[PDB]
Design a protein around this ligand. Sequence first.
Ligand SMILES: CCCCCCCCO[C@@H]1O[C@H](CO)[C@@H](O)[C@H](O)[C@H]1O
Ligand SMILES: CCCCCCCCO[C@@H]1O[C@H](CO)[C@@H](O)[C@H](O)[C@H]1O
Lengths: 107, 107
Amino acid sequence: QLTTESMPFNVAEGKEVLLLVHNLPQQLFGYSWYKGERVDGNRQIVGYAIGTQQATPGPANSGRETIYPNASLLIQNVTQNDTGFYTLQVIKSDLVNEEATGQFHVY
Amino acid sequence: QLTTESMPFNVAEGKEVLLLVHNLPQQLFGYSWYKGERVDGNRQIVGYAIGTQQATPGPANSGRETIYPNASLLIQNVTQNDTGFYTLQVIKSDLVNEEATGQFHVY
Ligand SMILES: CCCCCCCCO[C@@H]1O[C@H](CO)[C@@H](O)[C@H](O)[C@H]1O
Ligand SMILES: CCCCCCCCO[C@@H]1O[C@H](CO)[C@@H](O)[C@H](O)[C@H]1O
């Protein structure tokens, strides 16, 4: 089952965190990351097209994120606003989609 | 600008309803319809890839829906459970996706 977890779980303000992703389905179009516990386009961080390996910012993009080809998400110079939940949506080639939510806590 | 509306807005139990879709963006991979007001994989009705013109059922699929190449969704022999909100997610080529929510009322 698709899952995501934060390394580290508790993050000091101004440092770094990596959202690891495990168990990606086969045959994907792309990835979309969202701030919060649900898919919500108004809160999209980034969209990643696998076919072209291209990332594109959403409205929630801070400029401090970096998504990787396996959907992992790096955030640098973490701020208070970065704290809390993140939701990854994986878009499969049949447009039937899966989500996983994770969190980390800034201090 | 992406919107959806029901025809008819008030629907007799056992009849038919067409969810019309307006202002699709350019450059999309496909469509994802969900029951309710938000994107939620657990409530996904159908996924549709415009390149292959293939429909695939999600967990919320009743077997009474038909999706069209312009994302329009036909529901036949409408039940009480069908009532309420539907949400369309349009998957864009850059994976920064768009949503539109509509509804109809069964009586
Ligand atoms: C400094 C952070 C940049 C490094 C690139 C992040 C890529 C990490 O990605 C990780 O590769 C691991 C090895 O299999 C897997 O366990 C993980 O599922 C995956 O999340
Ligand atoms: C009962 C069978 C009806 C099939 C409906 C086919 C889809 C119709 O769809 C509609 O076609 C119109 C012209 O493009 C547009 O006004 C609409 O945006 C569109 O939703």
